[PDB]
Amino acid sequence: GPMPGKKFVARVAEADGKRVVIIPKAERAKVGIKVGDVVEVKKV
Amino acid sequence: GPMPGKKFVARVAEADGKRVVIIPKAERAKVGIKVGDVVEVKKV
């Protein structure tokens, strides 16, 4: 896959009562995310 | 609120067919996230 440490920008949303960052397929491809992967979320 | 640029570690999950990072209340308090806020997600 891609090298770790790539990032993308997103917005916190509500879904099923939870506060979530929804990750689109294209962003998963760009930064190499699969379900189960550890990520870091940083407030901007 | 807190200064921007704080971060926390999480795992990508599936919820309602979407790939999401679920943000618990305590992590929202630590990094100062509200619904609607812009964040950066980085693969580790």
Numbering used by the authors:
A (entry chain A), B (entry chain A): 1 to 44
Question: Please, what does the article write about this entry?
Answer:
E The remodeling of the loop connecting β1-β2 in design-2 resulted in the RIFT-fold protein, design-3. CD experiments demonstrated that design-3 and design-5 were partially folded, and design-3 formed well-diffracting crystals. The crystallographic analysis revealed that design-3 and design-4 adopted the homo-dimeric RIFT-fold. Thus, the short In/Del at the 1st loop position is the determinant for the fold transition between DZBB and RIFT. A single deletion in the DZBB sequence converted it into the RIFT fold. Most DNA molecules did not migrate from the well when mixed with the proteins with the stable DZBB fold (design-2, -18, and -19) and RIFT fold (design-3 and -4), indicating that these proteins formed large aggregates with dsDNA. Design-2 seems to have a higher affinity for dsDNA than design-3, as dsDNA shifted even at lower concentrations of design-2.
